[PDB]
């Protein structure tokens, strides 16, 4: 049952050290590496199963393969991905082209759609308006308190020359 592993070369097994983002290993823990056996990528009589993928079709239909066609499971969910699984130009409105999957509640047929993300909406623009606001507002605030301080200083100098001219 040990698996093949692209790009070992070798037609035998070996025991490698694997990491995150790698074939034949799912790390149980962060930073976990485990040392596991692996089968090489060169095919040999010892293989229980070869994994093949049709690239171009032959001259005649293959039973449960070319003759049957299982559909995708899920459809576009991010705003622009809808705009491209239909080709839409951001003017067409995406709420309409979202996919709809019927389903039965015995004698009630219900209907559900995703939840478009990255959807530009008024609610989002209200927040982009507010952040911008807050920086400027603060920036001006921070200047006044600055200027107000210079005053405390500049009319402290007008008291050090009311001191140095009294005595």
């Amino acid at each position: 049952g040990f698996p093949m592993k692209q790009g070992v070369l070798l037609p035998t097994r070996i025991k490698l050290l694997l990491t995150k983002n790698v074939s034949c290993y799912r790390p149980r823990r962060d930073g976990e590496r485990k040392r596991k056996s692996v089968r090489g990528a060169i095919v040999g009589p010892d293989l229980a199963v070869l994994a093949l993928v049709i690239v171009k079709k032959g001259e005649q239909e293959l039973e449960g393969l070319t003759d049957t066609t299982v559909p995708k499971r899920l459809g576009p969910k991010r705003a622009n991905n809808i705009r491209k699984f239909f080709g839409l130009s951001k003017e067409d409105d995406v709420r309409d082209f979202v996919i709809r999957r019927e389903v039965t509640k015995g004698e009630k047929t219900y209907t559900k759609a995703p939840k478009i993300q990255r959807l530009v909406t008024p609610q989002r623009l209200q927040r982009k308006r507010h952040q911008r606001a807050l920086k400027v507002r603060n920036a001006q605030a921070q200047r006044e308190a600055a200027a107000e301080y210079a005053q405390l200083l500049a009319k402290r100098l007008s008291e050090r020359k009311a001191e140095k001219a009294e005595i």
Binding site: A145, A146, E148, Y149, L152, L153, R156
Partner: protein, 260 residues
């Protein structure tokens, strides 16, 4: 040993909490905050052990989560949040306000204060540096950064603060003859004026203190917290005004009030 310690064994807990020996194993460990672990009074201690308001610890979270309790003006929801000397504890319901201020036995007192007095606090400025952009700042004993203070403000002076807004409305310089509250050592909670400081370059200036019983005693500077003029304190002091009576004196007073 590998990292921050997250528990507090009872007995390792500071005494001025007055936690009982048995009935557990641990005490609450004061969260990271504005006051130091060893000089703080967690909410759990205050809402339960002092005010008797909740019985369960669990019940203290239930009181708290309703945003009943609020410290120095802000709501505060942490069970073990570190409350500290000079802070202000308000109960919206029960219309009660409290200041955290020391006994004489060195303990945190339960001390009711007005709705008005609860508007502001006092802070010992602990350092005064020149910040970035050249903006000067002061930093007070409860970790407040206040930008743009008075030049005449320097380290050890105490400071009046709006709470409601973060600002400074006043300051008192550390000068021979200014009301002092002692915050550390076995003279913690004593109160009285200042006679004169010993200098000592490269270690621990000494602050010679005298109260309103013509009593005298010393502490390290660091442990001295200015709070007004003799007479005029900028906050209300706890009953007994931190004067410290002899064991005999105390005995006598208590067996003086004897006749029911």
């Amino acid at each position: 040993a590998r990292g921050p310690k997250k528990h507090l064994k009872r007995l390792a807990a500071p005494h001025h909490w007055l936690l009982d020996k048995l009935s557990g194993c641990y005490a609450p460990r004061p969260s990271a905050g504005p006051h130091k672990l060893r000089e703080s009074l967690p909410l759990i201690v205050f809402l339960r052990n002092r005010l008797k308001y909740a019985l369960n610890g669990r019940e203290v979270k239930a009181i708290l989560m309703q945003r009943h309790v609020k410290v120095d003006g802000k709501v505060r929801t942490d069970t073990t949040y570190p409350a500290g000397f000079m802070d202000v504890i308000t109960l919206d319901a029960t219309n009660e306000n409290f200041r955290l201020v020391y006994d004489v036995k060195g303990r945190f007192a339960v001390h009711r204060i007005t709705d008005e007095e609860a508007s502001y606090k006092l802070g010992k400025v602990k350092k005064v540096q020149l910040g970035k952009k050249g903006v000067p700042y002061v930093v007070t004993h409860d970790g407040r950064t206040i930008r743009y203070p008075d030049p005449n403000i320097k380290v050890n002076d105490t400071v009046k603060i709006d709470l409601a807004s973060g600002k400074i409305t006043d300051f008192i310089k550390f000068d021979a003859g200014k009301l002092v509250y002692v915050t550390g050592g076995r003279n913690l909670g004593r109160i009285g004026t200042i006679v004169h400081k010993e200098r000592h370059d490269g270690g621990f200036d000494l602050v010679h203190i005298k109260d309103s019983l013509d009593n005298t005693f010393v502490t390290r500077l660091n442990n001295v917290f200015v709070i007004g003029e003799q007479g005029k304190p900028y906050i209300s002091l706890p009953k007994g005004k931190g004067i410290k009576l002899s064991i005999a004196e105390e005995r006598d007073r208590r067996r003086a009030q004897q006749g029911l």
